[PDB]
């Protein structure tokens, strides 16, 4: 599970911008509610459990939400 070998600063800025679209209130975390809001804009209707599954696979410290370090770590990983 390494992050992508070539991770540019501009890709990191895009990760911050993407994070800010989920964390709209700017408290530095993404909740299941904030994730559901964005995915309902996408045309998906996930359940409260499906949302918790997607949070859980990004949530490295198990505190129930996603912070930017967790988001960035997962994003640069999927960047491969």
């Amino acid at each position: 599970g390494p992050m992508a070998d070539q991770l540019t600063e501009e890709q990191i800025a895009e990760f911050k911008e993407a994070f800010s679209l989920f964390d709209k209130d700017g408290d530095g975390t993404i909740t299941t509610k904030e994730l559901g809001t964005v995915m309902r804009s996408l045309g998906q209707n996930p359940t409260e459990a499906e949302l918790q599954d997607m949070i859980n696979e990004v949530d490295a410290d198990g505190n129930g939400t996603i912070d930017f370090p967790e988001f960035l770590t997962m994003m640069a990983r999927k960047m491969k």
């Binding site: 890709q11 895009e14 990760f15 911008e17 993407a18 679209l21 964005v38 995915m39 804009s41 996408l42 045309g43 998906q44 997607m54 990004v58 997962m74 994003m75 999927k78 960047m79």
Partner: protein
């Protein structure tokens, strides 16, 4: 008026709506988001 329009254009750029519309067309949300930034 010119000062106001410059401020407006700068703030509108802050929405990055082209980048955001790219995500929406692409939409496993996090994998698909990786593709847009890829």
């Amino acid at each position: 008026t010119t000062k106001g329009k410059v401020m407006e254009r700068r703030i509108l750029k802050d929405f990055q709506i082209g980048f955001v519309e790219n995500l929406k067309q692409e939409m496993d949300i996090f994998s698909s988001l990786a593709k847009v930034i890829g």
